[PDB]
Amino acid sequence: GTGVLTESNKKFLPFQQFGRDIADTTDAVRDPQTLEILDITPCSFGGVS
Amino acid sequence: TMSLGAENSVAYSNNSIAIPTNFTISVTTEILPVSMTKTSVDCTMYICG
Numbered sequence: 576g577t578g579v580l581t582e583s584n585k586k587f588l589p590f591q592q593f594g595r596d597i598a599d600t601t602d603a604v605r606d607p608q609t610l611e612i613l614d615i616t617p618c619s620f621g622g623v624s
Numbered sequence: 625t626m627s628l629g630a631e632n633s634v635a636y637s638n639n640s641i642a643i644p645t646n647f648t649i650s651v652t653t654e655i656l657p658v659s660m661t662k663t664s665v666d667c668t669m670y671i672c673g
């Protein structure tokens with residue numbers, strides 16, 4: 576993927592590796608080396624007017 | 625089978641009138657939609673990510 580990775584207050588169960596939004600979008604992950612939960616946010620985008 | 629309302633024979637005759645001797649002030653609420661949420665999609669980013 577591509578995005579901004581940040582420390583998070585999500586509480587994954589021990590077997591869970593990814594987190595998903597209401598509409599199937601991945602919005603968190605577990606780092607497989609040191610088992611922190613990272614919130615994924617899109618890199619900033621918008622129209623130019 | 626649904627009922628359309630209570631039946632009512634109006635007390636008509638060629639020389640009878642009904643006249644109201646009192647009134648009520650009624651306050652009624654009408655709700656109307658006026659706008660949607662304004663949306664735009666970067667469709668290179670929707671289609672191709």
Ligand SMILES: *[C@@H]1O[C@H](CO)[C@@H](O)[C@H](O)[C@H]1NC(C)=O
Nearest residue numbers: 589605606607608609610611
């Ligand atoms: C991976 O190695 C690091 C080395 O610092 C260690 O801290 C961590 O506990 C290890 N994680 C797993 C899942 O083995």
Ligand SMILES: *[C@@H]1O[C@H](CO)[C@@H](O)[C@H](O)[C@H]1NC(C)=O
Nearest residue numbers: 643644645646647648649650
């Ligand atoms: C008209 O209605 C009010 C209540 O809405 C009542 O107090 C009053 O006595 C009535 N007047 C007559 C003439 O019936």
